[PDB]
Amino acid sequence: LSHVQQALAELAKPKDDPTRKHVCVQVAPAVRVAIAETLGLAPGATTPKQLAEGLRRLGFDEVFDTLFGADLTIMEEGSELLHRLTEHLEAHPHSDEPLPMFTSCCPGWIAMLEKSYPDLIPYVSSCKSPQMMLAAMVKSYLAEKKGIAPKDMVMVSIMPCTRKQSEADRDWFCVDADPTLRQLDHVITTVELGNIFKERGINLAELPEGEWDNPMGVGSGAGVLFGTTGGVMEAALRTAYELFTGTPLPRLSLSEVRGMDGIKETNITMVPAPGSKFEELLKHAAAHGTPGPLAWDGGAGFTSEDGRGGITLRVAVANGLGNAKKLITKMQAGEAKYDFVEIMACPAGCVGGGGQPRSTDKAITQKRQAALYNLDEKSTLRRSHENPSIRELYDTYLGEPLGHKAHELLHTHYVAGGV
Ligand code: SF4
Ligand SMILES: [As]
Numbered sequence: 001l002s003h004v005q006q007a008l009a010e011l012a013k014p015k016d017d018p019t020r021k022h023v024c025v026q027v028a029p030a031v032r033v034a035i036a037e038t039l040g041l042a043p044g045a046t047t048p049k050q051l052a053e054g055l056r057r058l059g060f061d062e063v064f065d066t067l068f069g070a071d072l073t074i075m076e077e078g079s080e081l082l083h084r085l086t087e088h089l090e091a092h093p094h095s096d097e098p099l100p101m102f103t104s105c106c107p108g109w110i111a112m113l114e115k116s117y118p119d120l121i122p123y124v125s126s127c128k129s130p131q132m133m134l135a136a137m138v139k140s141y142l143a144e145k146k147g148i149a150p151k152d153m154v155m156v157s158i159m160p161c162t163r164k165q166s167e168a169d170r171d172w173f174c175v176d177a178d179p180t181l182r183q184l185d186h187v188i189t190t191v192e193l194g195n196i197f198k199e200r201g202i203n204l205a206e207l208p209e210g211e212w213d214n215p216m217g218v219g220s221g222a223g224v225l226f227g228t229t230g231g232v233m234e235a236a237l238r239t240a241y242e243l244f245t246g247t248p249l250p251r252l253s254l255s256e257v258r259g260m261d262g263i264k265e266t267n268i269t270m271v272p273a274p275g276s277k278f279e280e281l282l283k284h285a286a287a288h289g290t291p292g293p294l295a296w297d298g299g300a301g302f303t304s305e306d307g308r309g310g311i312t313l314r315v316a317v318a319n320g321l322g323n324a325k326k327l328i329t330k331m332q333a334g335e336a337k338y339d340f341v342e343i344m345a346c347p348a349g350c351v352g353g354g355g356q357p358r359s360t361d362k363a364i365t366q367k368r369q370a371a372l373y374n375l376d377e378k379s380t381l382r383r384s385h386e387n388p389s390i391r392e393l394y395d396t397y398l399g400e401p402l403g404h405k406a407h408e409l410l411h412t413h414y415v416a417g418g419v
């Protein structure tokens with residue numbers, strides 16, 4: 001049986017069947033914006049809570065927003081970038097945590113990494129993706145909070161992507177030592193979900209507004225605050241930037257790199273906060289000979305007559321896989337110098353995933369991107385560490401980002417040659 005069929009069979013069971021599981025769903029933003037096209041409408045023509053009402057009518061017991069998972073991914077990856085930068089600046093880098101750092105949320109990049117780039121594995125962030133962080137959390141924290149055994153929970157994710165099931169199927173996303181209980185059971189694409197609605201005569205555009213559940217299991221709404229982060233990569237940088245400098249990082253505008261297809265970049269200058277440790281490390285020369293395919297050049301430093309020291313963080317974004325291979329070749333010969341790199345396999349990112357509806361409009365992905373966030377939300381910047389649901393989760397259950405419990409729950413590893 002397909003994963004859609006397995007998921008619909010769990011859903012079809014009466015609440016009073018003894019074998020009825022608790023079934024949880026999580027929804028990616030790129031789904032929410034494109035699912036209206038499944039009914040022949042424009043992107044964004046159905047609201048996020050119309051979609052939550054539709055899912056609730058298929059029989060899900062919770063409906064969750066993958067942006068909660070993204071907030072966990074920001075916490076982890078932001079601290080992870082800052083931690084590697086700090087070890088580099090003190091000239092005591094750990095060998096398993098070199099710069100540059102690459103992101104890890106795209107499974108298409110991960111497969112290519114493991115198959116064709118095994119020497120780069122140590123450079124890749126150890127963070128799980130947003131969907132996996134959220135799955136790991138509901139099967140541990142929330143299960144325990146509700147007195148529900150993890151074996152009696154099923155978790156589905158609606159994704160814009162045909163590769164996210166292969167991410168969920170990596171072996172160690174297993175709950176408590178058996179491969180048989182998976183943190184994330186089933187992935188359904190946008191078009192599969194649109195097709196399930198149509199077969200049952202459910203027209204999203206005409207449903208009433210429903211509601212999201214909070215993965216914490218108390219309090220109303222989705223457990224994410226109003227506003228936008230600019231996405232995981234940007235919010236991770238903002239995390240590190242704002243601790244390092246004491247000053248806000250605005251919304252980033254990436255520019256095209258010339259001579260390379262599908263690659264955008266930015267250079268972010270950073271003066272450490274006065275009185276801070278980061279100011280010390282920059283004051284106290286030998287930050288010359290070292291191993292690895294990507295050898296870090298020691299950073300793009302800058303100076304002032306009076307001692308203002310700074311560093312400039314060199315950021316690149318690559319779409320998709322053929323263009324990423326060319327960046328890597330150039331990083332390896334010393335022609336492109338980057339400290340933090342994001343690789344996505346799709347030319348337009350997740351809004352253009354292979355699980356999305358097909359359109360004759362050459363600009364469909366830019367319309368999906370424009371409608372991802374409600375016009376009022378775009379003007380409010382938000383920060384994951386200020387989310388009271390995230391803070392409660394860390395203060396009562398995980399400890400510190402990068403710490404032991406967070407590592408066990410929210411971090412992963414990569415295998416040379418793939419899986
Ligand atoms: S971006 Fe395209 S490829 Fe990378 S994950 Fe989202 S969908 Fe899959
Ligand atoms: As280390």
Ligand SMILES: [Cl-]
Nearest residue numbers: 106107110167
């Ligand atoms: Cl993966």
Ligand SMILES: [Cl-]
Nearest residue numbers: 129130131132
């Ligand atoms: Cl994800």
